[PDB]
Nucleic acid binder design. Structure first.
Lengths: 377, 43, 49, 52, 132, 48
RNA sequence: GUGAACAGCCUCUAGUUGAUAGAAUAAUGUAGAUAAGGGAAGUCGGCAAAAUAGAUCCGUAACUUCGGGAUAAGGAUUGGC
RNA sequence: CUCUUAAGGUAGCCAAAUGCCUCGUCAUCUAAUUAGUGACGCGCAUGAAUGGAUUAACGAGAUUCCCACUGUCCCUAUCUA
RNA sequence: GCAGUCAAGCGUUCAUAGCGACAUUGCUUUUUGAUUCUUCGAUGUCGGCUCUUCCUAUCAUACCGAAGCAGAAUUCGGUAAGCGUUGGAUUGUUCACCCACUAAUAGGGAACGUGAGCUGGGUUUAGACCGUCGUGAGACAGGUUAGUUUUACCCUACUGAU
């Protein structure tokens, strides 16, 4: 598509403005308010720098970000005490949840402070795509460590990039390898610090590690937020920030709530997000899962094609079992928009993104469709 | 009802006092775990 | 109960009398009426076929 | 328009009598459009995201 | 906006679902009000052939739904008395949607149009194919 | 307490009593005003 | 006799023809009904009523303890000679 | 480290038949919804045989919505014992 | 709840077109308090439905006066209760709150009109679950479910009839 090639290249010229609030130096700063006044102006100026983006670009409509200052302080304590700052990415959109701009803030107080990218549910994708995935991560030279949070995996049916194409076990040997000495000398344990977005399993993963459920789901509205550390190894401590969101970029506004960015239970204008699920799945795949027999595509009455619409999917899915409106029965589209977008994020309606390259994206993407089913023979 | 059994009555269904009853009670009190030297699920 | 083709509330407590303006069943029809402004169209003779 | 505010305790006054204590610059986008005189007559309140 | 029309028999109260005669995407209209209706305790205000009703779209294009917009009745199933003598009635009810001036949003009308609607509304007679 | 929903009266009060008339020939209560310039003619008529 | 039927309806053997009656046809009732166009706007609430119903043939979803759900839904046919 | 002679709500669940403030807040359904559903939880006063959560089937049990239908209504009229 | 007086000041430059600080005199019994006079050998104790009449402190309609009344649209005031004052979503609601039409959707009274006129949703019997409190019987004017609504033929009143 011509629209795909232009709107990808527009974002690349504007990536440099996003930065962070950075804690300028405070050397002694004994203070009742003078450290606080010193820390306001870093975030207050960074708030102004993102405000100039709205005049600069048109229809740029970016991700929401933590506008509360006290949430950003909980990032500051975790990035400071940890020698390893760690990013959790979803593998359905690996380029989006990653922030390269935070890694610049990691190398500031470095003494070989490192960057790590651990990326979950690799078994969902396929064998073929992860080979094509492995090319991009090394070329930008940060990290790639796939995994899947299962103690016994069921992944039934040139070494150079295919050796790390296999994801990893439940083992913590891969965080054990990068940094052997501690950055403060006196503690025997080092630490590692975890930063990721909410609705990506940063709490679902390290629940399984400690096995005692200390990490539990996102914090209360009335508090500051939190900050929590947990000790599980001979030689590493765990730290995680309260989950927050970085201002990277966003396109078309549907992909945000289609992913785990915006809440599904709060959404307005459901036509867009239900339109993205329509084209990015073939016809008989939904017909195997729910058994809708949608067809209705007007199929040589108004136009030519096999592509779906946002209307005719939500109607036909809710022209199944129930789901009628008050006063008159017109099939209740918005109630059916919840149960489709929840099955998108949970992984019934799975899709893999094209791997990024300088401007181009393909019309014909790679796919995954199992011909077998428990009901289909 | 409270006339029918010593566990009876109340605005909920609860016993009210300890169900373990001494060996040396009288007929009419012995309704419950009689002379329980232990109770609960065994370990 | 006991009838629906009626009038429910005849009156208030005070005055303790049924007023003259309530609706009440009795004779209908066979009254003297005057109806004005009826326009004559045809006055035909007797011995006229 | 005019919006009332607790200077000490950070609340917002709704038109009848309420005092909904909302998080600042997050969901006050949603509590204002009830107080506004304009109703649903305006086309499609297609988007709303306040500026700094 | 509505001129003089001789009284004809009221066949469409509030809550009626009449068809949609035009080609503006809507399939049927749900009558919620009649412009210029009266006032009587417990009485539903009713429409007629040629009245102007406020109505919503229950079925059709999703752009047209969930908004209240005025509409004009073009057919009626209750029989009415014309002054020249005859009692006539169509087979089903029908209406076309309009702006509050009285101009019409659709382009054409399928089915016949009642004659007392074509005299009263100038735009409906412009788009009418068959007049009774 | 007030009527809670106002509505006009049922019926007409200038036509009371609804009692049966005194005779099947209804009376003429009033005749038109006399104009003595015109020739002699009657004022009403009886018919079936 | 009809029918799947000791159902409902009409008949033979057997039994009864007893329950205060006559004349009129106002309202308001009790019991049984029908309705133009709209179709729950009535109402605390589809309360009461209406619609579907026998059989034969095609056709039957989510879910499921895999037994069910099921008469699912939905759509045709029916006399006489 | 420590105060109350023990221990400090774990797994789950929610404005629930259990939430005072309260017609909670945000979506949603509707022309309009103190009702209904999906969420969120410093929960006045939820919580694990004073059993917790989940459930096919079953119900003259409670609740909201739709299709078909209709004098429940617009608005009353008529007939029979 | 409603209406006066007095004037500092607002009304881009002016006290009273329209508003009225600081004070001060009143009316009303549709709020809510206070009191215990009448009824405990019982006045059937919410709300709606149905129907008639009354009040003016007037929303609409008639004719008028003033304006910071050019027209249009409006605001203030007079005579005036003759005549109108609604259809719906939610709640048991009165109240409230929206949507829509309209000339306009004014406020009230009559034993907080009206149960031998109704319905029984609610409250306030007995059944039952939950929450907190109580060692316990039990408690809650906290939440949710299920629960019989009787008689007129007498007199007067009224409507018709001798």
């Amino acid at each position: 598509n011509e629209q795909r090639g232009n709107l990808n290249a527009k974002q690349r010229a504007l990536a440099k403005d996003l930065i962070v609030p950075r804690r300028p130096e405070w050397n002694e700063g004994m203070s009742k308010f003078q450290l606080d006044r010193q820390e306001k102006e870093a975030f207050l100026e960074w708030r102004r720098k993102l405000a100039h983006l709205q005049e600069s670009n048109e229809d740029l409509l970016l991700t929401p970000f933590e506008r509360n200052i006290e949430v950003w302080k909980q990032l500051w304590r975790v990035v400071e005490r940890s020698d390893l700052v760690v990013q959790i990415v979803d593998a359905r959109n690996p380029l989006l949840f990653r922030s390269v701009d935070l890694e610049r803030y990691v190398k500031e107080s470095d003494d070989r402070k490192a960057n790590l990218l651990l990326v979950n549910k690799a078994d969902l994708l396929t064998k073929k795509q992860r080979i094509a995935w492995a090319k991009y991560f090394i070329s930008k030279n940060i990290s790639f460590t796939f995994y899947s949070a299962l103690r016994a995996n069921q992944l039934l049916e040139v070494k150079i990039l295919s050796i790390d194409q296999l994801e990893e076990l439940f083992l913590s040997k891969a965080p054990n390898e990068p940094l052997l000495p501690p950055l403060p000398g006196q503690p025997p344990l080092i630490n590692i610090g975890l930063v990721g977005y909410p609705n990506v399993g940063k709490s679902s993963t390290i629940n399984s590690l400690v096995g005692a459920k200390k990490v539990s789901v996102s914090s209360t509205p009335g508090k500051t937020k939190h900050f929590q550390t947990i000790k599980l190894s001979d030689s590493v401590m765990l730290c995680d920030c309260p989950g927050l969101v970085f201002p990277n970029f966003a396109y078309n506004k549907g992909e945000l709530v289609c992913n785990g960015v915006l809440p599904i239970d709060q959404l307005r204008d459901y036509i867009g997000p239900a339109g993205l699920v329509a084209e990015r799945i073939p016809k008989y795949y939904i017909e195997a899962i729910y058994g809708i027999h949608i067809q209705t595509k007007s199929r040589d009455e108004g136009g030519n094609g096999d592509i779906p619409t946002a209307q005719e999917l939500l109607v036909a899915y809710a022209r199944a079992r129930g789901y009628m409106t008050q006063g008159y029965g017109s099939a209740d589209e918005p109630r059916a928009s919840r149960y489709i977008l929840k099955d998108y994020v949970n992984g019934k309606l799975l899709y893999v993104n094209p791997p990024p390259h300088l401007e181009d994206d393909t019309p014909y993407t790679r796919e995954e469709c199992e011909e077998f089913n428990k009901d289909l023979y | 009802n409270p006339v029918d059994h010593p566990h009876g009555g109340g605005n909920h269904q609860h016993i009210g006092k300890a169900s373990t009853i001494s060996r040396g009670a009288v007929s009419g009190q012995k309704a419950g775990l009689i002379a329980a030297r232990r109770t609960g699920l065994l370990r | 109960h006991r009838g629906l083709r009626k009038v429910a509330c005849i009156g208030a407590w005070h005055p303790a009398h049924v007023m003259w303006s309530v609706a009440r069943a009795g004779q209908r029809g066979y009254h003297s009426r005057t109806s004005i402004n009826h326009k004559i169209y045809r006055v035909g003779k007797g011995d006229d076929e | 328009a005019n919006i009332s505010f607790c200077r000490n305790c950070e609340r917002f006054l709704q038109p009848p009598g309420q005092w909904i204590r909302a998080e600042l610059e997050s969901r006050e986008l949603l509590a204002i459009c009830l107080r506004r005189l304009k109703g649903l007559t305006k086309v499609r309140l297609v988007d709303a995201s306040f500026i700094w | 906006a509505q001129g003089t029309k001789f009284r004809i028999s009221l066949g469409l109260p509030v809550g009626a679902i009449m068809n949609c005669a035009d080609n503006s995407g809507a399939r049927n209209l749900y009558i919620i009000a009649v412009k210029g209706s009266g006032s009587r305790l417990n009485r539903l205000p009713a429409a007629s052939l040629g009245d102007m009703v406020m109505a919503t779209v229950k079925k059709g294009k999703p752009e047209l739904r969930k908004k209240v917009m005025p509409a004009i009745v073009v057919r009626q199933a209750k029989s009415w008395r014309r002054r020249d003598g005859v009692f006539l009635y169509f087979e089903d009810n029908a209406g076309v949607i309009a702006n509050p001036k009285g101009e019409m949003k659709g382009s054409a009308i399928t089915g016949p149009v009642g004659k007392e609607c074509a005299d009263l509304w100038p735009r409906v007679a412009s788009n009418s194919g068959v007049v009774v | 307490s007030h009527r809670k929903y106002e509505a006009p009266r049922h019926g007409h009060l200038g036509f009371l009593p609804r009692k049966r008339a005194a005779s099947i020939r209804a009376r003429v209560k009033a005749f038109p005003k006399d104009d003595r310039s015109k020739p002699v003619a009657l004022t009403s008529f009886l018919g079936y």
